[PDB]
């Protein structure tokens, strides 16, 4: 501008705001999708459940004894059973609109819980502080997915986009989000790239917390 104002820095600075804007939208609506407290709050807290049941079951087949594994558990963890019964009793009190009593049991629970424990609150916490990780793991791997999915849409068509399988689109999303960027799977569609910047912006920032947390868990098994 120190020269009767520059022409170049006119028709371009507004052409870029037209490109970022796209991403900002794609990005913005991704933080909404995974933000839907009804859509995402169930999809995640569910994906989580299927993580355990489908896990525990495996740690159960590696024992030959299917139910054998089940008893060994209800056994090594005694509280797991009197707790279940409380849950059932609280729930039958609830189902009957008998909340006054529910008020009670819930409290008569805390006591019963404190008592039978002192190194117990640790096992419950270390367990809670455990499902929380499993929660995060979802939320993240979930946002990753979108990117993957989104890249699928605008890439599946074009000739030899490398992004054929829906899985192939996940590989790209994951490799990208981790910043590893192998490269065996790049978009190839000028538009698929516009999106790639958002999947990158998101997937990395998101994957970061994960690794960040997964990296705190490690500095504990090494100490």
């Amino acid at each position, epitope marked *: 501008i120190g020269d009767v104002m520059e022409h170049p820095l006119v028709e371009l600075g507004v052409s870029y705001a037209a490109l970022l804007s796209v991403i900002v939208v794609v990005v913005e609506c991704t933080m909404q999708l995974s933000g839907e407290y009804l859509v995402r709050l169930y999809l995640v807290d569910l994906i989580l459940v299927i993580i355990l049941w489908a896990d525990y079951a495996y740690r159960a087949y590696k024992s030959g004894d299917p139910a054998g594994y089940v008893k060994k558990t209800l056994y090594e963890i005694p509280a797991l059973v009197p707790a279940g019964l409380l849950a059932l009793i609280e*729930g039958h009190l609830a189902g009957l609109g008998l909340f006054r009593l529910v008020r009670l049991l819930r409290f008569l629970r805390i006591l019963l819980i404190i008592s039978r424990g002192s190194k117990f609150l640790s096992a419950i916490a270390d367990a809670a502080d455990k499902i929380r990780f499993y929660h995060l793991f979802g939320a993240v791997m979930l946002t990753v997915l979108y990117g993957a999915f989104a890249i699928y849409i605008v890439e599946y068509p074009d000739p030899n986009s490398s992004i054929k399988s829906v899985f192939d689109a996940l590989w790209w999303a994951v490799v990208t989000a981790t910043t590893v960027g192998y490269g065996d799977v790049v978009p190839a569609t000028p538009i698929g790239k516009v999106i790639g910047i958002a999947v990158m912006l998101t997937g990395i920032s998101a994957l970061t917390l994960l690794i960040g947390t997964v990296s705190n868990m490690f500095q504990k098994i090494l100490v």
Partner: antibody
Amino acid sequence: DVQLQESGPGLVKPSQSLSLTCTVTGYSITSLYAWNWIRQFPGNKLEWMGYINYSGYTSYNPSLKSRISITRDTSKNQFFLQLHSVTTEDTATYSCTRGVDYFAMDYWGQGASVTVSS
Amino acid sequence: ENVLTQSPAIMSPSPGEKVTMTCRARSSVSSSYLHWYQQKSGASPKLWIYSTSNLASGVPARFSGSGSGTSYSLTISSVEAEDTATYYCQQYSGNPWTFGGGTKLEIKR
């Protein structure tokens, strides 16, 4: 000292999902009692639709059972109602109340009108 | 659908008069699961009497409730203007909750 607030579209086209968002304040929907949806028809009939309680277990009404879906968002302290494919008859005034001991509903929301029409 | 039936349908009492309403169920209902609400014109219902005879909050003692089985009764020791409204009983037996057809009540002036 508490209050729930119906909110959402006041009009829905035949066979489309009717939606509502009750956001309660002054109490937690995850502490106790049942939070249910009650709709009042033009004839001034009152029909309980169903609920979701502090523990998050839903109890719907048989008649709506195949269309209704009460859910909630513990975070923002608000539960919602969803009705698949409403019809001219589903036009009524939906409102959320709080079920207490023996299910007496002590706190009713403002009441939200919802018209189904083209 | 343990249907509740209220009577009368309309009711035109006069200031000072006493008066009673009725709510009868197809099946029987536990006295502690019977409730009454008072819906004033263009407002949502207000809990008026819970568990048959227990008066809800701000409800004045001019009111009262009693009964059991398959027949309950809401009674006003004396009506007053502020009483114009519609009363609905509510029960909980089977899965579905249920309300009566209400009982309008207009005072005579």
